[PDB]
């Protein structure tokens, strides 16, 4: 009876330090020694009501690597969009009589939580719900940070881009805040600054953070340079252009980076990360996405199997 | 190595001599051109140098060098001697070579030449697009 | 001829104080004594490449009120530019051989200015170009403010809402900043504050302006409460909700307003002005819209009719 | 009455040489001395079932330049034919009870001819019908050629581009083939050559014509360089690229052109005519478009005004 | 270590006679004796950016017949179409960290080749890339020809339809040209003739070919009558109608066909093959498509297994 | 003046020198470079000349000059002595510099370097795009 057995994976707020570690530990074991028949006989729903390349494809791939089957959809051409109503509630109430677990991405905040109240004992895993949570993305970022840094404590972590609206940067900050001595560097346009509540949360825990103008400023001391895109749509085409240069990364900027420094990006990117960075040893975004496989496999195993004998 | 008659652009900061040749299509003539890149200046270490025989520039053509080579010196040479010499004065407008940073600006998709109004101020030059009327820092416009 | 004869009307920036007074004086005369045949034998193009109900309808009604004919379109879908990707330049190059003046609204900044370089001796009037200009909107606003306050100087003017992106408020501020003694009160969410370049412009001219977080905070001294719609979509759903009540107007908020104060709104409105304000004596947004006729009419007369004739 | 009074204008094939001369002579008089009220009290329908900027706008401007009113549409989306699948016949049967003449452009060949059988005594003018006719386009082309060359016989005319599918070039060739001594030069990609039925038509009349693979190959003797857009989409992306340069025009290609030679293009253009040709004295495609007014105007006057009145 | 192990299947130009034979030989063995657990534990991406019925469904079915799992999409509702950018490059770089092989169909020529430079060691198989290659279609056509004719040498092969633009007829001609003594018969509309470069290629190798007016002409001597559709869109509705009759097959036309003659069509068809042909012993298009299963299974086995012990 | 040790591209046809400086971004170095455009010559009347100090080109970097300066002469000059001269021979692949004529080619919208296979055909040179597999005359690829 592991901690996460038959548990819903909805909010990063619902996960403890132990919970996170349990998941990452399992992700490591399964990576080193796969268990392709672990979830055999299991059928899992993959319901995406919003676009996705990596979250859906990796989750579904993770299900197969464990031997589970898949049913679901990439958008609405089902009873919900076609024949009106078919509330999300009734949609889940029905699907939960078919599958062993539900993975869902939805445009409204709270969707995944809602599914939870109509899915009976079928565990639902939140693959993104509006501007709220995106827990499996955080789990893979942490595994990726712990893998390349060998730890989640006393790290110098810089976050760049749209810190105001990015749900993944919010979740990662929250997550890392469950560990000790980490130091944050928020680099963003004035209009997209890390929200004040995140800063209060950090103060409340005695965690150090500071605001910076450009990457070049903090480069020399970061272990993890977490990049995110700054959608121009959230700014005035003119406004953007004036501050662009200080939120986009290019090879040369890495000239004085620590040997261990790894550049991360939840993806997709547009131009905030120049392609000439891809060839550097620091580029670790594709490896990061590759880890989604292990983090997500770990999650499905912990939630679907009461006692992982690995 | 000292042209009979023509123009000589001296004291061009490193990595700007090529740009100038590019942006202003200086190499698009039959006239003999002589170029020097990364040459020893005496103090600034190296600087680019361009010579164009049987060719002279108006004070407006020279002013167009201000943003790229402010300290540059344009020398008018006739009959082997450097008759007159002048330094680039900030221009009133800059057309054709700059690109408006506003992606929604009409100038991008349509067949018109770029154009910005030049106004010097707080530590830098501000450029205003004739079209979208958005103003930017010469640093951001020149950045691309 | 009159100072605006055959002139293009593109940017508020290119209209002197005398030009604005000239348009308003003309708008007042025509309003008082109509000239149904002043523009007989003239054919004007009404070209809208972006949605519009008031700016296009009033302008076309103005053309008819003066005896002129109309040709044009409401969207570019059924035009060569639209189907066979013709350039705006060629579109104008061609249309300018047909009509005596061109009224255009376009989604891209600079459009109207561009038309100018391809319309030969045909006047073009900017009905809105991206986030840049909307001069005829300001002309009717000015007319409206002067008609209700009796002057355009030494006024207390408040502007509320999306001040960061609103082109009509940017334009109105510039326009009013051509007259004397005006003092401004800017009420907008932190994320949508009036841009700095506007604030500097006001300083160089030694014009007094101040920021306020609520409408109720300035009610007592404003002569003009200029309301615009808080572009909600420009904010996080929850962000908006927290500051909302400070940027919406209702009848009860007008308890201590000045007798001469008028509430204006370029429209359309959505939420910002409750309907219970409609029947209060302060409500002047529809009268404002009605004033679009005169002004739009005065503008056309000055541009197309040679010698004055007020 | 005049020979075109109440006649339908459907196919270039139904217009005699005298008819073309009559329209041009009328187009010249109206151009010189306007008749603003010639069609007062007339209401004309402008019905476009396919996109158009010049043909529809000029035609409507013409109606107004003559004092007539207009009703119609730019697309069939919001008409009974369009929503409740009404037949074109019924549409005309009905509209013909409202107006004094019908101008229509339709995607299907024969449309205008069909309208004719259901419009009672209401004249219909073909503004384009599939790949069949576009007579008013040819009328303005002829006017334009005669205005710049002083005649319509013994001319050297080159036509370039999509000669296989271009209806305007098919029509112009037929029209010019009604006059004497004209010799043609057809420059088109092998895949888009002038159709045989046109070549035979020219032979039966003993008219000289020849094929050429490049514009530069005939430049020196043409009086009219009639450019049309190489419908790229009608070719393999790579196929096009290989022969492209032979069918595009730029200023440098005009080095050995005849002083009287004019470059025409029914428009819209895309690539085929570079903009550096615009300011050369040979560029006459916009003047050509402007000539659409006169002609379209002459056509309407002849059809709707009884006795002549040049 | 078979020849095709971990090799990309991009262009027919990259396949040798031996390569083709190796694939067909394996296709035969796997057909006779399936190996349903061969690719167990493997997960394969099925990425179709363009429509498809047979190529995608058979490939995916082939994966299951070998025991492999599948993840992918039928169009774009992922990060590439939804959230802009997400270049094809980044899309592959990410997906290749999930799957063991990538099957892709894309509208641009060169897409599959491009995927190859970002997929690391993950083999990508081209299921169609613009008007360039479609190798798995050729592999199944050859297997189908070799199966019904018992050979790929000294064959009388007629190809009918759009030979100019058909990427599959081009590829098959290239393929067969890697064998000896084959004789080709190209029957097509003048406007859609087999391209000259294909003909040079044949001359260069001393392979006989000839152009024919109708099928009836070569019928009596063909072993393989390869049909393809002649999309009317690539011709003038009128033009088409005049030559249609000679490029469409009907039962009666088979009256004098060799007993061994098999009619092939890559599908889908519209009318070029009348349904009354379906009942004849010559009809072999559905069998042909059925072979896609074996050809494609063979490919996946050769590429994913270093040593097929069958 | 004659350079010490480095390389010197001689006999470039007029209007190709600058083109070469651009296409191969040879001016993006901190090395002294002297350039002569539209200089007098005999075997071609007027030519361009590029001198790059302390820099050398692999025999493949030279072949890349073929489509632009087929009759050019590269010199290795070291210690004021013309070490080893070399003539540009047609390479079998040209990358980065060319642009694919096929507008539907994936190379345009993606972050990939262009690349063609070279093949001589008498009268012209055939260039086959790696992504495309489409072949075009160098006259079509270069002549844009
Ligand atoms: N016939 C000539 C005459 C002069 N120059 C060039 O003109 C520039 C300026 O020369 P000059 O004014 O005579 O001496 P300086 O000390 O260089 O003047 P300044 O300090 O202002 O540069 C130098 O690059 C010199 O080589 C030249 O190339 N050919
Ligand atoms: N120390 C040197 C030596 C030679 N060169 C240049 O390198 C080329 C050498 O040419 P050369 O050996 O003198 O033979 P040529 O008679 O010039 O004939 P060709 O052009 O075939 O070399 C010339 O541009 C010469 O000016 C130079 O710049 N510096
Ligand atoms: Na009217
Ligand atoms: Zn601009
Ligand atoms: Zn290509």
CA D146 to CA D262: how far, in whole Å? 11
Q: Among all chains, which residue has been given the structure tokens 């399964």? A: A30
Domains, chain A: 1-133+292-310 (3.40.50.1370), 134-291 (3.40.50.1370)
Q: How far is CA C188 from CA C211, C230, C231, D267, E170, in A?
A: 8, 8, 11, 48, 65
The CA F31 to ligand 2 mean position distance, Å, reads 20
CA D56 to CA D137: how far, in whole Å? 11
Contact yes or no for A242 and B132 at CB 8 A: no
Cβ–Cβ under 8 Å, residues F67 and F93: no
CA A10 to CA A136: how far, in whole Å? 9
Contact yes or no for A293 and E41 at CB 8 A: no
Query: Within 13 A of C295's CA, how many CA atoms are on the CB side?
Result: 24
Cβ–Cβ under 8 Å, residues C277 and C263: yes
Q: How many residues does chain D have?
A: 310
DSSP run (H or E) holding B117: strand B115-121
Q: Among E129, E93, E127, which residue's Cα sits nearest to residue E111?
A: E129
Identify all chain B residues contacting C129, using CB atoms and an 8 Å cutoff: 106
The CA B100 to ligand 4 mean position distance, Å, reads 5
Q: Among E273, E248, E299, E244, which residue's Cα sits nearest to residue E10?
A: E299
How do strand E124-129 and strand E101-106 relate by DSSP bridges? parallel
**Which residue's alpha carbon is nearest to atom 2 within ligand 1?**
B2
C53 Cα to chain A: minimum distance (Å): 25
Report the alpha-carbon angle E193-E199-E205, nearest 5: 160
Q: Where are the domains of chain B?
A: 1-91, 92-144
Instruction: Name residues contacting ligand 1 (CB within 6 A).
Output: B 2-3, 8, 10, 49, 51, 73, 75, 77, 80, 82, 85
D113-120 contacts: CB < 8 A, separation 24 or more?
D113/D10, D113/D11, D114/D88, D114/D89, D115/D88, D116/D8, D116/D10, D117/D89, D118/D89, D118/D90, D118/D92, D118/D93, D119/D92, D119/D93, D120/D96
Q: Among A200, A234, A160, which residue's Cα sits nearest to residue C236?
A: A234
Of the CATH numbers 2.30.30.20, 3.40.50.2300, 3.90.1150.180, 3.40.50.720, which one belongs to the domain with range F92-144? 2.30.30.20
Chain C's closest residue to D40, CA to CA, is C41
Q: Which atom of ligand 1 is nearest to the CA of B10?
A: 24
Is residue D135 part of an annotated ligand binding site? no
Instruction: Determine phi and psi for C100, rounding to 5 degrees.
Output: -95, -5
Q: Which of D62, D234, D268 to mutate to test the interface with C (most CBs of C within 10 A)?
A: D268
CA A265 to CA B7: how far, in whole Å? 52
CATH class of F1-91: alpha beta
CA D192 to CA D166: how far, in whole Å? 9
CA F79 to CA C206: how far, in whole Å? 70
Task: Cite the annotated binding site of E for L-aspartate by residue number.
Answer: 84, 167, 229
Q: Which of A239, A241, A242, A245 to mutate to test the interface with B (most CBs of B within 10 A)?
A: A241
Q: Among C179, C168, C266, C284, which residue's Cα sits nearest to residue C223?
A: C284
CA E27 to CA E33: how far, in whole Å? 10
CA C107 to CA C75: how far, in whole Å? 11
b/e string for C82-105 if b means 16 or more Cβ within 10 A?
beeebbbbbbbbbbbbbbbbbbbb
Taking the Cβ of residue A43 and every Cβ of chain C, the question of whether any pair is shorter than 8 Å is answered with no
Q: How far is CA F50 from CA B29, B33, F33, F34, F47, in A?
A: 17, 12, 7, 6, 10
Which is catalytic among the residues E105, E156, E178, E282?
A: E105
CA A63 to CA A99: how far, in whole Å? 13
Q: How far is CA E54 from CA C140, D105, D291, E147, E159, in A?
A: 63, 41, 55, 20, 21
Q: Which parts of C51-195 fold into alpha helices (H)?
A: 54-65, 80-83, 88-95, 111-116, 135-149, 167-176
Report the alpha-carbon angle C78-C82-E85, nearest 5: 140
Instruction: Determine phi and psi for E293, rounding to 5 degrees.
Output: -60, -45
Which neighbouring-strand residues pair with D101? D44
How do strand C156-160 and strand E208-212 relate by DSSP bridges? unpaired
Chain B's closest residue to F33, CA to CA, is B37
Cβ-based neighbour number of residue E147 at 10 Å: 18
Neighbouring chains of B at 3+ CB pairs within 8 Å? A, C, F
Chain B's closest residue to F14, CA to CA, is B30
Cβ–Cβ under 8 Å, residues A303 and A15: no
Say whether D123 sits in a helix, a strand or coil: coil
Contact yes or no for B132 and C88 at CB 8 A: no
Q: Which atom of ligand 2 is nearest to the CA of F51?
A: 28
How do strand D183-187 and strand D209-211 relate by DSSP bridges? parallel
Chain B's closest residue to F25, CA to CA, is B18
Cβ–Cβ under 8 Å, residues F19 and F68: yes
Which is catalytic among the residues E7, E29, E31, E54?
A: E54
Is C134 part of the annotated catalytic residue set? yes
How do strand F6-13 and strand F73-75 relate by DSSP bridges? antiparallel
Q: Among all chains, which residue has been given the structure tokens 């890149």? A: B37
Cβ–Cβ under 8 Å, residues B39 and B47: yes
Cβ–Cβ under 8 Å, residues F97 and F144: no
Is residue F129 part of an annotated ligand binding site? yes
Q: Which parts of chain D fold into alpha helices (H)?
A: 17-32, 54-65, 80-83, 88-95, 111-116, 135-149, 167-176, 196-204, 237-243, 285-290, 293-304
Chain D's closest residue to E236, CA to CA, is D165
CA D51 to CA D105: how far, in whole Å? 9
Q: Which of residues 100-119 of F touch D (CB under 8 A)?
A: 101-105
**Which residue's alpha carbon is nearest to atom 23 within ligand 1?**
B10
DSSP secondary structure of chain A:
--TTTT--B--GGG--HHHHHHHHHHHHHHHHS--TTTTTT-EEEEEESS--SHHHHHHHHHHHHTT-EEEEESS--STTTSSS---HHHHHHHHTTT-SEEEEEESSTTHHHHHHTTSTT--EEEEEETTS--HHHHHHHHHHHHHHHS-SSS-EEEEES-TTT-HHHHHHHHHHTTSSS-EEEEE--GGGPPPHHHHHHHHHTT-EEEEES-HHHHGGG-SEEEE----GGGS-HHHHHHHGGGS-B-GGGGGG--TT-EEE--S--SSSB-GGGTTSTTB-HHHHHHHHHHHHHHHHHHHH-S----
Identify all chain E residues contacting A60, using CB atoms and an 8 Å cutoff: 71
CA F67 to CA F95: how far, in whole Å? 12
Cα–chain center distance at A275: 22
Cβ–Cβ under 8 Å, residues D26 and D301: yes
Say whether D104 sits in a helix, a strand or coil: strand
Which neighbouring-strand residues pair with A160? A187, A227
CA E162 to CA A36: how far, in whole Å? 48
Cβ–Cβ under 8 Å, residues B116 and B130: yes
Annotated catalytic sites of A, by residue? 54-55, 84, 105, 134
Is C232 part of the annotated catalytic residue set? no
Identify all chain E residues contacting D237, using CB atoms and an 8 Å cutoff: 131
Task: Cite the annotated binding site of A for carbamoyl phosphate by residue number.
Answer: 54-55, 105, 134, 137, 267-268
B41 Cα to chain F: minimum distance (Å): 12
Contact yes or no for B132 and C132 at CB 8 A: yes
| Residue of F2, F13, F32, F83 to mutate, ligand 2, most atoms within 8 A of C-beta | F2
DSSP secondary structure of chain E:
--TTTT--B--GGG--HHHHHHHHHHHHHHHHS--TTTTTT-EEEEEESS--SHHHHHHHHHHHHTT-EEEEESS--STTTSSS---HHHHHHHHTTT-SEEEEEESSBTHHHHHHTTSTT--EEEEEETTS--HHHHHHHHHHHHHHHS-SSS-EEEEES-TTT-HHHHHHHHHHTTSSS-EEEEE--GGGPPPHHHHHHHHHTT-EEEEES-HHHHGGG-SEEEE----GGGS-HHHHHHHGGGS-B-GGGGGG--TT-EEE--S--SSSB-GGGTTSTTB-HHHHHHHHHHHHHHHHHHHH-S----
- B and F: number of Cβ contacts within 8 A: 54
Say whether C269 sits in a helix, a strand or coil: coil
**Which residue's alpha carbon is nearest to atom 10 within ligand 1?**
B82
Q: Among all chains, which residue has been given the structure tokens 């994913």? A: E304
Give me the sheet containing A224-227, strands edge to edge.
A208-212, A183-187, A156-160, A224-227, A262-264
């Amino acid at each position: 009876a592991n901690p996460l057995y038959q548990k819903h994976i909805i909010s990063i707020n619902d996960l403890s330090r132990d919970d996170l570690n349990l998941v990452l530990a399992t992700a490591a074991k399964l990576k080193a020694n796969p268990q392709p028949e672990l979830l055999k006989h299991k059928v899992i729903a993959s319901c995406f009501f919003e676009a996705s390349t990596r979250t859906r494809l990796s989750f579904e791939t993770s299900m197969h690597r464990l031997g589970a089957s898949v049913v679901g959809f990439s958008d609405s051409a089902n009873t919900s969009l076609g024949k009106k109503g078919e509330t999300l509630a009734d949609t889940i109430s029905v699907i939960s009589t078919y599958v062993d677990a539900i993975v869902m991405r939805h445009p409204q905040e709270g969707a995944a939580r809602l599914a939870t109240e109509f899915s009976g004992n079928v565990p639902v895993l939140n693959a993104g719900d509006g501007s709220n949570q995106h827990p499996t993305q955080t789990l893979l970022d942490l595994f990726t940070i712990q893998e390349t840094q060998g730890r989640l404590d006393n790290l110098h972590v810089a976050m760049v881009g749209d810190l105001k609206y990015g749900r993944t940067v919010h979740s990662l900050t929250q997550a890392l805040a469950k560990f000790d001595g980490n130091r944050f560097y928020f680099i963003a346009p004035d209009a997209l600054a890390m929200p004040q509540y995140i800063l209060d949360m950090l103060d409340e825990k005695g965690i150090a953070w500071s605001l910076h103008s450009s990457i070049e400023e903090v480069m020399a001391e970061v272990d993890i340079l977490y990049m995110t895109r700054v959608q121009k749509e959230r700014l005035d085409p003119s406004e953007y252009a004036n501050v662009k240069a200080q939120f986009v990364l290019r090879a040369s900027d890495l000239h004085n980076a620590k040997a261990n420094m790894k550049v991360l990006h939840p993806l997709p990117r547009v131009d905030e990360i120049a392609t000439d960075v891809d060839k550097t040893p620091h580029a670790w975004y594709f490896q990061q996405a590759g880890n989604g496989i292990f983090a997500r496999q770990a999650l499905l195993a912990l939630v679907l199997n009461r006692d992982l004998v690995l | 190595e000292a042209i009979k008659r023509g123009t000589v652009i001296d004291h061009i900061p490193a990595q700007i001599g090529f740009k100038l040749l590019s942006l202003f299509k200086l190499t698009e003539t039959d006239q003999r051109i002589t170029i020097g890149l990364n040459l020893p200046s005496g103090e600034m270490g190296r600087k680019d140098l361009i010579k164009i025989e049987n060719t002279f520039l108006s004070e407006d053509q020279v002013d167009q060098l201000a943003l790229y080579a402010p300290q540059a010196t344009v020398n008018r040479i006739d009959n082997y001697e450097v008759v007159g010499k002048s330094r680039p004065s900030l221009p009133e407008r800059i057309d054709n070579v700059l690109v408006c940073p506003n992606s929604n600006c009409i100038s991008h998709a349509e067949p018109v030449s770029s154009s910005f109004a030049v106004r010097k101020r707080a530590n830098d030059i501000a450029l205003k697009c004739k079209y979208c009327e958005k103003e930017f820092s010469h640093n951001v416009v020149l950045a691309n």
